[PDB]
């Protein structure tokens, strides 16, 4: 008889948080930004095309020096490119071909990748022996791992498919902080600019927020109808945009604890595969499954232009650490740098 | 050129990297991918062990070297995750190898898992990631089926069976028909085999089935199907 009281107490608390959040809402973001000028139609163009991959590209991640980038595809090879001169700085043959995520360390020395093997492998690039050799692999997950993020050079958060993000220690190979609390398979995660608290999205339309220091969940957001599979913080760290499987991105806020705007057109009916921000945050960038990316005005809620030029869907999207250019890696084995 | 002495060696390194990428791409174009998937305790472990003993946590990939051609059979059954999200990894596999056990009718939530394997089979082959692939279907445990059908009955657990109460041939061809007429609505050949615990050569069957798959794709390309 206690489980009935606990479930009804939980639903009462959900109602209390909902109507207390409703009284927290003064207005909407569409109401405030009616006094600012729009950006107008922008025309970003392809500057480089990076034809090195054979299978479909699943994930890319820029370098912190805004020049190199790592790409991962289903042929079983990470390749590290110099995006200025389009040369391939490195080619890393993987142990498992089914790689669904990759990440480049902000110290530059390390790289990591993972996928359907349930293992997160970590390679040491800058080596005295010449080749890119695997430093160590992190094996503590049961489902596939869907995202990797270096926070500094010795610890990495790995979202997985067992409704569990984690936090590892590469010097020992064991995890230190298991972030249990999701109910759907965790699809994406985004680290903060100050890098002390990350956000996570899963297969339950819920974008739960955590801190890396203690280990507790902080807040929990729910404004989506279907599966959310992309997430990205704001440039300061007080907001984050969310891209879900029903052609909707929406911007949640950390202190206001609500959504502020949502992004949808009627002809756009296919889900978002990746989302990212600019350095100023005026433009959201969303890579859909109608093969085109969109630059959304993050204040006036309309789209500031399209990006076409991929024959297949845009499975990964990334903006540099200084905002000079935009990489789109897609299923037609091509990356495209845009500005 | 206006490249440096250091920059030209970077372009030569990039071209050697290109050389190794193409020499690996036209090596991974050679072996044939087979998506094996089978649930409900269908004997997948002894199935793979049988194939590998007659032949010479995470996802597993098994190699095969028959008639100087090479297969990669990807087994994925150690996933506690949603298959709606990682199945687009196999948008062009050559064939889906299903494995259903013959005996798991009248095996029970309250539902018979033969109906659950029917639902899994339908929801896999109705995905849009499997147009150019075929469905190589396996039915395992023949002897357990014939013992269970000389012992028990089938007409009460499946009402649509109108056949002899001690029959095994018409029973297994009825449930093979039941698997076939899920109707992937584009008409396409679904190959089938009746294996057992001690079936020696079913690697020969999957060889002939992927051969007929590739040949059927070529014939429909040349309009002489």
């Amino acid at each position, epitope marked *: 008889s206690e489980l009935d009281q606990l479930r009804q107490e939980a639903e009462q608390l959900k109602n209390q948080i909902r109507d207390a959040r409703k009284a927290c809402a003064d207005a909407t973001l569409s109401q405030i930004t009616n006094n600012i000028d729009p950006v107008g139609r922008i025309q970003m163009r392809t500057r480089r095309t990076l034809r090195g991959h054979l299978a479909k590209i699943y994930a890319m991640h820029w370098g912190t020096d805004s020049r190199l980038l790592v790409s991962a595809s289903q042929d079983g090879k990470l390749i590290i490119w110099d995006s200025y001169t389009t*040369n391939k*700085v490195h080619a890393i043959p993987l142990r498992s071909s089914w790689v669904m995520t990759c990440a480049y360390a902000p110290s530059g020395n390390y790289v990591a990748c993972g996928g359907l093997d349930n293992i997160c492998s970590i390679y040491n690039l800058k080596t*005295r022996e010449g080749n890119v050799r695997v430093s160590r692999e992190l094996a503590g997950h049961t489902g596939y791992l869907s995202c990797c993020r270096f926070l500094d050079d010795n610890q990495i958060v790995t979202s997985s498919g067992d409704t569990t993000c984690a936090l590892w220690d590469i010097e020992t190979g064991q995890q230190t902080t298991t972030f249990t609390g999701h109910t759907g398979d965790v699809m994406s995660l985004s680290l903060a600019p100050d890098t002390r608290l990350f956000v996570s999205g899963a297969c339950d339309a819920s974008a739960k927020l955590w801190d890396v220091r203690e280990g507790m969940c902080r807040q929990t957001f729910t404004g989506h109808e279907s599966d959310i599979n992309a997430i990205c913080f704001f440039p300061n760290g007080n907001a984050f945009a969310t891209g879900s499987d029903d052609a909707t991105c929406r911007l949640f806020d950390l202190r206001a604890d609500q959504e502020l705007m949502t992004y949808s057109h009627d002809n756009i009916i296919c889900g978002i595969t990746s989302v990212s921000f600019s350095k100023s945050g005026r433009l959201l960038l969303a890579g859909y499954d109608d093969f085109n990316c969109n630059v959304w005005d993050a204040l006036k809620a309309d789209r500031a232009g399209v990006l076409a030029g991929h024959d297949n869907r845009v499975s990964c999207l990334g903006v540099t650490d200084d905002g000079m250019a935009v990489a789109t890696g897609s299923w037609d084995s091509f990356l495209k740098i845009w500005n | 050129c206006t490249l440096s*002495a250091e920059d030209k*060696a*970077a372009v030569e390194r990039s071209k050697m990297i290109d050389r190794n990428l193409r020499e690996d791409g036209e090596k991974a174009r050679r072996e044939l991918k087979l998506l094996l998937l089978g649930t409900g305790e269908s004997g997948k472990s002894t199935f793979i062990k049988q194939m590998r003993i007659i032949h010479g946590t995470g996802i597993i990939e098994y190699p095969f070297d028959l008639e100087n051609i090479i297969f990669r059979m990807v087994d994925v059954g150690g996933q506690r995750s949603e298959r709606r999200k990682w199945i687009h990894c196999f948008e062009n596999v050559t064939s889906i190898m299903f494995l259903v056990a013959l005996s798991e009718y009248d095996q029970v939530d309250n539902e018979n898992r033969m109906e659950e394997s029917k639902a899994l089979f339908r929801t896999i082959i109705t995905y849009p990631w499997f147009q150019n692939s075929s469905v190589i279907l396996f039915l395992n445990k023949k002897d357990l089926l014939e013992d269970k059908i000389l012992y028990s009955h089938l007409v009460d657990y499946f009402p649509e069976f109108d056949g002899p109460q001690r029959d095994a041939q018409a029973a297994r061809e009825f449930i093979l028909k039941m698997f076939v007429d899920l109707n992937p609505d584009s008409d396409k050949i679904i190959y089938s085999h009746f294996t057992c615990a001690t079936d020696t050569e079913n690697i020969r069957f999957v060889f002939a089935a992927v051969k007929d798959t590739i040949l059927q794709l070529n014939l429909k390309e040349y309009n002489l199907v």
Partner: single-chain antibody, 236 residues
């Protein structure tokens, strides 16, 4: 760890021929470009040959452009240099030095021990000069070594292709800094090189008795790769 050992020295007859072989043990040999340099037994060191990764591109110094030949063996993991028309200006100590070129690598990072070929009977390039040959300083003082070029080493991409090498007395040279700003992995962080166009200064702060030796500037803007004359830092 990394090992580069060469054989094929000694004493031979002038005018004849001689082969030379540095075997590499401890790294991925097929991915490294290789160089042969040589040092006159009382003068500084000069560059003689370079072979690329996979033997695609071969460059010779114009002194020995035609009577020298270079080759490698990536499975058997050796690097051969064969020398015909053996003069007495080829009297030197021969060093085998690996070098890899991607974005942000450290060429000339490891140098072999060297053989010695002792025998007896600078046109259309950048010459790297330095007009000081002995700076003896006590430990505990900032020492600035300079080196002058003929043309601006600053290329269009922004890099300045100046390399500094230390040589302790009695062993192989060591790469200190590369592209005149970036320190090698293994050197103490008291060295600091800087400059612009033609001004090129290596500054050592808080010196001790481990930084005593000869200092060589080196250019990489174009071929041939021409060294500097040297600068010795002694004790007191």
């Amino acid at each position: 760890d990394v090992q580069l050992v060469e054989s094929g020295g000694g004493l031979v007859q002038p005018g004849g021929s001689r082969k030379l072989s540095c075997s590499a043990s401890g790294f991925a040999f097929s991915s490294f470009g290789m160089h042969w340099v040589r040092q006159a037994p009382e003068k500084g060191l000069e560059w003689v040959a370079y072979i690329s990764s996979g033997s695609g591109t071969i460059y010779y110094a114009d002194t020995v452009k035609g009577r020298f030949t270079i080759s490698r063996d990536d499975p058997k993991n050796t690097l051969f240099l064969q020398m015909t028309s053996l003069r007495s200006e080829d009297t030197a100590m021969y060093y085998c030095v690996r070098s890899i070129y991607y974005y942000g690598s450290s060429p000339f990072d490891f140098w072999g021990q060297g053989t010695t070929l002792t025998v007896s009977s600078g046109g259309s390039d950048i010459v790297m000069t330095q007009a000081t040959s002995s700076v003896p300083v006590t430990p505990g003082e900032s020492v600035s070594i300079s080196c002058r070029s003929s043309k601006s080493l600053l290329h269009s991409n922004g890099n300045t292709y100046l390399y500094w090498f230390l040589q302790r007395p009695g062993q192989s040279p060591q790469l200190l800094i590369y592209r005149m700003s970036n320190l090698a992995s293994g050197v103490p962080d008291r060295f600091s090189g800087s400059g612009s166009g033609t001004a090129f200064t290596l500054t050592i702060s808080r010196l001790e008795a481990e930084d005593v030796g000869v200092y060589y500037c080196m250019q990489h803007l174009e071929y041939p790769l021409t060294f500097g004359a040297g600068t010795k830092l002694e004790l007191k």
